[PDB]
Amino acid sequence: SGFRKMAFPSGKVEGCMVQVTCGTTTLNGLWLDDVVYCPRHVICTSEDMLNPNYEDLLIRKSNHNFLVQAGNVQLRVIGHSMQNCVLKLKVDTANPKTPKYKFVRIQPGQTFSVLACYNGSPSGVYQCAMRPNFTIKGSFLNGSCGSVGFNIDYDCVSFCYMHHMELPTGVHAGTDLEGNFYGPFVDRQTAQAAGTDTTITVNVLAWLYAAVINGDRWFLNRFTTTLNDFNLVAMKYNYEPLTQDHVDILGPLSAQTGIAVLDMCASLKELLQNGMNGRTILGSALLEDEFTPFDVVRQCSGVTFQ
Amino acid sequence: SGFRKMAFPSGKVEGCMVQVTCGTTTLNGLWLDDVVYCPRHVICTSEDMLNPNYEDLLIRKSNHNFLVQAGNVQLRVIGHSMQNCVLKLKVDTANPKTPKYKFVRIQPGQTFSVLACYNGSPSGVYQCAMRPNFTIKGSFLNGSCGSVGFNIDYDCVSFCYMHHMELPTGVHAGTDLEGNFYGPFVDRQTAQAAGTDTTITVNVLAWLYAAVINGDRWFLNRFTTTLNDFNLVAMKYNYEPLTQDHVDILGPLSAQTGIAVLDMCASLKELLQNGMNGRTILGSALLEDEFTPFDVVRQCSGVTF
Ligand SMILES: C[C@H](NC(=O)CN1Cc2ccc(Cl)cc2[C@H](C(=O)Nc2cncc3ccccc23)C1)c1ccc([N+](=O)[O-])cc1
Ligand SMILES: C[C@H](NC(=O)CN1Cc2ccc(Cl)cc2[C@H](C(=O)Nc2cncc3ccccc23)C1)c1ccc([N+](=O)[O-])cc1
Numbered sequence: 001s002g003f004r005k006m007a008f009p010s011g012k013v014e015g016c017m018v019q020v021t022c023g024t025t026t027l028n029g030l031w032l033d034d035v036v037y038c039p040r041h042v043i044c045t046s047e048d049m050l051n052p053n054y055e056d057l058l059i060r061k062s063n064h065n066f067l068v069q070a071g072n073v074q075l076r077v078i079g080h081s082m083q084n085c086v087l088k089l090k091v092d093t094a095n096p097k098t099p100k101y102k103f104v105r106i107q108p109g110q111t112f113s114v115l116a117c118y119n120g121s122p123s124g125v126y127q128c129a130m131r132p133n134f135t136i137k138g139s140f141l142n143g144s145c146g147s148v149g150f151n152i153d154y155d156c157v158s159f160c161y162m163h164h165m166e167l168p169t170g171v172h173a174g175t176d177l178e179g180n181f182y183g184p185f186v187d188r189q190t191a192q193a194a195g196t197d198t199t200i201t202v203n204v205l206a207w208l209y210a211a212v213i214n215g216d217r218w219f220l221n222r223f224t225t226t227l228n229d230f231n232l233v234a235m236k237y238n239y240e241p242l243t244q245d246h247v248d249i250l251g252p253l254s255a256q257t258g259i260a261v262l263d264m265c266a267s268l269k270e271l272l273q274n275g276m277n278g279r280t281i282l283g284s285a286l287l288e289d290e291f292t293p294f295d296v297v298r299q300c301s302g303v304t305f306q
Numbered sequence: 307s308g309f310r311k312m313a314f315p316s317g318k319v320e321g322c323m324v325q326v327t328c329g330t331t332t333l334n335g336l337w338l339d340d341v342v343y344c345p346r347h348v349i350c351t352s353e354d355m356l357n358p359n360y361e362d363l364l365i366r367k368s369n370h371n372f373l374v375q376a377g378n379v380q381l382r383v384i385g386h387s388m389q390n391c392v393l394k395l396k397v398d399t400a401n402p403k404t405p406k407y408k409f410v411r412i413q414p415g416q417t418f419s420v421l422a423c424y425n426g427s428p429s430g431v432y433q434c435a436m437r438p439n440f441t442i443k444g445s446f447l448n449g450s451c452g453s454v455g456f457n458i459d460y461d462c463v464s465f466c467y468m469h470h471m472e473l474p475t476g477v478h479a480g481t482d483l484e485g486n487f488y489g490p491f492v493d494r495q496t497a498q499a500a501g502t503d504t505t506i507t508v509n510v511l512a513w514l515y516a517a518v519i520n521g522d523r524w525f526l527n528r529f530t531t532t533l534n535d536f537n538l539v540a541m542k543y544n545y546e547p548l549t550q551d552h553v554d555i556l557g558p559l560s561a562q563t564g565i566a567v568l569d570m571c572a573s574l575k576e577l578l579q580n581g582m583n584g585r586t587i588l589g590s591a592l593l594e595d596e597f598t599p600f601d602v603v604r605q606c607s608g609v610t611f
């Protein structure tokens with residue numbers, strides 16, 4: 001029993017974190033096999049950030065301008081290239097701690113663990129979600145650039161995020177491991193702002209199914225709804241539209257608890273109208289949206305507490 | 307910017323987790339040097355759990371009755387002994403991944419990271435606090451016994467908790483690594499219940515400082531209180547008493563934000579009496595009590611391990 005915001009064990013990623021330095025700038029890199037991946041803005045000064053010409057900045061660098069430190073050992077850079085917004089530094093040593101891995105690009109609503117790092121050293125691990133507006137609500141201080149987001153499946157690490165920047169509202173933006181940004185963001189200090197954020201409806205439904213599995217049913221009602229009427233109400237509370245894909249994805253949780261997806265949608269409509277009236281759901285007074293259907297199935301018991 | 311419930315990096319502990327099997331029972335063990343530590347109830351059937359005599363159950367076991375698996379390698383048990391509610395299995399191989407460590411017993415209100423494990427394989431890491439009633443609000447399924455809690459100080463892992471059981475309300479109970487329970491619990495299938503819990507006042511104040519540091523000030527007010535008047539109000543809401551030690555501990559956060567501890571107490575008093583009025587603090591509609599003053603300073607300063 002219980003339900004916590006749980007991260008994957010970070011050990012497999014901790015053995016890949018290194019420090020990358022270019023001139024006065026120091027940030028984190030991810031060392032996998034003989035390549036170190038890091039944000040390309042490591043080659044910029046603060047002045048370069050308004051309108052950096054990364055190609056022009058990079059051509060002026062040699063391999064020996066990049067200092068890569070793995071623990072207390074200096075790695076030798078033998079090649080460099082830029083791919084989108086990521087710099088790939090070929091090094092003369094393959095990481096002996098390289099786990100079984102993959103690079104995956106995720107969609108909004110997906111969750112992942114973040115290993116916050118500073119100077120190539122891990123400080124903490126936390127769980128978060130790719131918001132519908134393509135930002136993440138992280139906890140990142142200066143020096144955290146290059147920290148990565150990941151999921152683990154059977155000893156295989158799927159890297160999905162690399163941290164690049166903090167936006168004016170305090171939220172965070174980054175790229176996949178091929179250097180493509182999530183969202184309409186760019187690695188320059190120009191006027192950029194996150195779009196209006198919304199609640200991840202399919203995740204709130206998954207978390208209501210988690211509450212039922214753990215024994216709580218107070219929020220259920222005798223009603224059902226059509227998918228269209230649910231969306232018309234949900235959109236008024238700044239909730240993302242619920243698609244037939246989301247309904248299909250909730251199928252297993254619906255079968256385990258005996259509560260139809262549209263019947264759980266009716267419960268959500270009522271919670272949005274009434275609030276919680278002093279009650280909590282899984283120890284929260286707000287509707288939680290950073291647990292996916294897959295996270296709920298992974299964490300919860302396969303036996304509902306009837 | 308940002309403020310998350312953050313756990314310590316778990317790598318140093320992951321390299322210590324093993325699977326321990328005795329008959330039909332499988333649970334997790336912690337392998338440090340040449341000893342594997344695990345709950346002593348691994349030697350109980352289920353009928354034995356009703357009224358176990360652990361010495362009588364243990365004397366009937368040989369070293370070969372304990373199957374210890376580290377990854378895909380079987381470890382050889384060469385000795386066994388019991389210390390309080392923990393079984394210590396001496397093995398023929400020292401763990402090459404043994405980190406610098408200590409066994410420490412924590413006090414209620416202190417936080418730690420839990421590495422949830424099943425079959426000697428880590429599944430997740432989360433942060434929690436030892437409640438004033440000595441339980442932890444964990445997330446554990448069958449097979450999680452032997453999972454451990456820890457903190458990291460510089461390069462040293464301080465192990466503080468080993469999971470033993472789930473209570474009827476869904477909360478959890480366990481021991482320190484010397485096998486002493488936190489709370490009035492016993493490792494037996496008998497009627498046991500968590501006592502009435504209280505809120506950790508010093509931690510709520512620390513989290514209010516974290517909110518101020520991160521730009522939320524709506525709850526600040528022009529008022530102050532005495533420590534005595536604050537405690538009279540706090541006891542009325544099932545909050546733990548605030549001591550001069552707690553006030554001293556919050557000193558640095560008070561100096562950084564310019565909000566005296568008793569000034570923050572006046573803000574907390576008004577929140578208890580009036581609620582949040584539709585507002586949130588750090589994305590929460592409840593007053594969070596599972597961040598200590600040190601956790602707040604650490605997260606707001608970027609300490610690494
Ligand atoms: C908007 C402003 N950015 C800058 O002053 C300098 N940054 C420009 C910039 C542009 C583009 C790209 Cl790709 C990277 C970067 C760098 C950046 O965002 N780095 C960081 C990343 N993550 C977390 C940070 C936390 C504190 C400081 C830097 C962080 C550097 C700012 C204002 C206030 C705060 N705050 O935490 O209160 C953070 C940031
Ligand atoms: C109370 C009841 N316990 C038992 O059925 C058998 N347990 C007796 C027992 C006694 C004493 C000691 Cl020291 C240990 C133990 C074992 C135990 O508590 N193990 C566990 C530990 N943590 C988390 C568990 C989660 C599900 C099942 C076991 C867990 C075994 C129970 C009923 C339902 C649930 N549930 O969440 O659905 C949890 C627990």
Ligand SMILES: [Cl-]
Nearest residue numbers: 105106107110
């Ligand atoms: Cl995805």
